Symmetry: D2
């Protein structure tokens, strides 16, 4: 199936590893030029190198904290200088939480609000005008199954991802007049490095069988009884931002292996 | 993006015209063999001929009423004998309604229950064993946006489509152990023959401006302010049934131009 | 808080035991006259006597199958005969299922369709006219948490209850012009006879700790870690049918001790 | 119906006028003592006098900004000093927004986050321990129908009310172990002074018929074709915080005259 995004410019936040890198490889595979965004400079250089070598597309690196207005303004200025504007924006930067409401500090709340919601708000403000000038585009928000089905141990994550899923919906209605399609993707269990680090930490005193720990997670949560690969998730991001998904507007698409328990 | 379904067997109910035909064309393009199912045999021939002539695939026609157990049995036996079993089943046969709860006959409720729900129950019972034996597969239920956001004039449609959406999710959990992935797609406004028929009928005594009538429907209901083409929609069905959507299980995916008013 | 329903006529289907009898007692307490509806004549006669004797309200018994048109007709005609019309209607008759989609007979699908969906359809058709003539009224559909969050073992129950929940909403918009407010209640785990019966059955060969079994069910499904009593749930049915809930139209209200896993 | 809250202490934020004052009167009518919280000292002082005279319960005034940590600490301190703790907490303080995402300043996103979400986080942290110590209680969050069905003109409101609804759910699962029941209420159109102010402003130049403007709003959005009264809404607040709603946990209850367009 032709995706029709050859030569389009795709900005992916949090794209030096895990889901965000797999997303960047999937767009690169389809001929899209890539803007990679993350904090660690070295991992970012590796990712760019590998994308260029494997896929022969242009890759720009922006090494900034997207949870800050300065960081966002640098992404916007770098995209403008190198490419003129973006055709695709994937908001993927984000991270799990771990607290009780009774004990969490206000600053922790603030931090996930800036990272999960304010980054998407500021990137929409900064990139929509260029995308509009280029004739339209696609914006995706990677929220989470937690945005609707909260996990008990991460209330701040649940709340901020919930806010992000609403944000995506409100942006979709505001920019569709610009021929800009906005949608949300809500992933289930996706096997990424932090899951492995967590599985090892939690099994350190009972045998170290981190793979069995992950298998029990999938057994308890997903009818599919396994985690997804980042690559299988990325496919959906690429599809939704392609010329083949032109009637998707303001929707939330779950990619979750049966984990959502309700209709 | 490679779909990986070349040479797979796709059964599409309601595929002699409109959306079902566009879906069959989308699968045929990707090299899938096609079983077309509809009642009227004239249009089934014309569609089948056009698919073989345009895409070079095998097409089996089954002219039956899928709202009957005998019709479904015929489809199951045609697939078994011609192909062994199906890899893909798309439940698409269905039709709008138009009544009030206070006036509609019990027999009309029963008609839509058979067509929208029991056809899918019976096809799953009949085709899942062969699909299992082939190593897995994909099943899609075309419900509608109305399965969650009911349109005032068609309560029977709304109820039976809601029931269909729940069926899809329950079948999803039952059969994922067989590597069979079941999902639902909920389309918004899709420009099909019946819409154009209706527009022309509703404007016959006031100017015959059927295009104007369709445009006001779009403006009323969809932020994108147009209907989808059946081809735009077909893409989603093709993607969901492909080797690129292998983590989609028990989900309901809206394709609606913004029409869904809630999160 | 005054419910303002003294002297009103409440029809409760499935009201010789369990949740239905608790709902009838809740209405009786507030001085409503009661139409009790259930199949077993003596259980119904006994429920009627005890309501009349505890609460001093009028009680009419209609011993019929509400899953049949003739049974619904008998209810409508006894209401008309004894009271003129109903002010309140609670669709409560229903029962659990237990099957796989691969194995269940079409006839079983049919039975649950008749009992969960068509009874409410036919009772709305039969009772709305008299309710309208009395100046308005309230109708409730007792669906289930399973209407949105399906239980693995009872797909027919899940599909038919989801259908009921949609019916409730579509009826809501049709009859609000008559000052009739229709809403749905979705209960979680409610301790009824069948629950205790099932706990005793499933523990007959392992120790007969039926209390242990129910506790584990509650522990698995509900954050509050107990079943509701039928009387706790009844309060909500009485409130929603009262002069204090005059802005509730077309809603679904969960009463589930935390069991719903999503927003 | 006995609510069983006579002598309990209910804290209501934003209760010097509108919905919060109606809720405070509703608890008062039921014999609950009242903690009134709002910024404007004058309106608060008189709302307090008028409640005591009219209902003969105790009334504590706390004139603070609950969007600030200092404001919340003053509430918690004054409740501790005057009553020991609270039995009931209603988070009601909040206000509409009005902007585009493209134009809104970061400061404005921040203000709505503090007011609609952080007020509830901070009041949960400050009041739950006293509520726990009293044997349990009830907490309500007044979010909005906009939490799931966004209004085009107030993206910040839609996003922060969505976050508040998720917060309510995450809190409910955390504190149910303390015998504290947390739920959310999502009102539709409720006739409060800002609606009237708005209807006048927007009719200033076309005839001044502010009532007909409100009627056109109700006609467009609500099948019941009128706004609710604050007193109408308040009944559901008092019910949910009463001893008659003991199985309601982590639910979202809409009170919206049919406004919600989906199931
Ligand atoms: N894994 C899972 O099971 C699921 C994940 N998700 C969502 O997917 C998204 C990606 O998660 P995943 O791939 O697991 O996470 P990883 O931790 O593997 O990847 C995070 C990426 O984002 C970058 N990043 C983190 N914070 C910032 C920041 N402030 N500014 C710029 N870049 C940042 C990281 O690089 P660096 O540290 O150098 O900044 C890294 O490239 C997240 O939004 C997550 O919530 C949703 C559902 C499930
Ligand atoms: N068009 C739209 O805006 C939307 C449509 N949908 C759904 O899409 C699906 C396809 O509809 P659409 O393309 O619009 O409609 P069409 O009328 O254009 O297509 C209906 C197809 O179903 C066949 N059909 C109808 N009843 C039966 C039956 N009992 N047995 C076998 N085939 C049958 C028809 O052929 P024949 O009569 O010859 O049997 C025809 O091929 C339906 O389920 C509809 O509810 C969902 C959302 C929006
Ligand atoms: N119990 C629970 O945990 C939950 C229950 N529900 C729903 O609550 C409702 C009542 O359930 P519950 O109290 O548990 O069940 P019970 O079996 O204890 O009560 C069911 C009532 O319905 C009557 N009934 C059943 N079939 C018919 C029929 N065809 N015609 C007329 N009356 C009938 C029964 O009497 P008779 O047999 O004499 O006809 C009985 O009085 C049902 O809709 C159920 O689906 C929803 C969620 C949870
Ligand atoms: N009216 C409607 O149609 C709907 C309203 N709602 C929600 O209902 C709630 C009540 O709104 P409504 O009654 O309409 O609004 P009003 O503006 O009429 O009342 C707001 C009350 O809250 C107080 N308040 C506002 N901000 C603060 C603050 N920062 N700290 C302390 N008190 C504050 C106000 O007093 P003061 O200004 O002196 O501080 C006033 O007493 C809100 O949460 C709103 O979002 C939900 C759905 C619909």
């Amino acid at each position: 199936m032709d995706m029709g995004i050859s030569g389009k410019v795709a900005v992916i936040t949090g794209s030096s590893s895990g889901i965000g890198l797999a997303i960047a490889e999937g767009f690169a595979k389809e001929g899209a030029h890539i803007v990679l965004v993350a904090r660690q400079v070295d991992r970012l250089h590796e990712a760019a190198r590998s994308l260029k070598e494997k896929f022969g597309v242009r890759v720009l690196e922006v090494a900034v904290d997207v949870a800050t207005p300065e960081g966002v303004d640098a992404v916007v200025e770098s995209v403008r200088s190198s490419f003129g504007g973006a055709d695709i924006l994937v908001n993927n930067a984000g991270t799990g939480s771990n607290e009780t409401i009774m004990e969490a500090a206000d600053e922790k709340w603030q931090f996930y609000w800036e990272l999960h919601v304010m980054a998407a708000v500021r990137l929409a403000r900064g990139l929509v005008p260029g995308m509009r000038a280029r004739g339209g585009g696609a914006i995706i928000h990677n929220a989470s199954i937690c945005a609707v089905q909260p996990l008990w141990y991460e209330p701040i994550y649940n709340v901020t991802k919930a806010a992000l899923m609403m944000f995506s919906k409100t942006l979709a209605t505001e920019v569709i007049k610009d021929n800009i399609r906005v949608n949300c993707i809500n992933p289930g269990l996706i096997l990424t490095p932090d899951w492995i680090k967590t599985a090892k930490e939690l099994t350190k005193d009972n045998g170290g069988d981190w793979k069995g720990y992950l298998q029990s997670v999938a057994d308890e949560h997903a009818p599919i009884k396994r985690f997804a690969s980042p690559e299988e998730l990325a496919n959906f991001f690429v599809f939704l931002c392609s010329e083949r998904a032109t009637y998707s507007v303001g929707s939330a698409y779950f990619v979750d292996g049966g984990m959502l328990k309700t209709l």
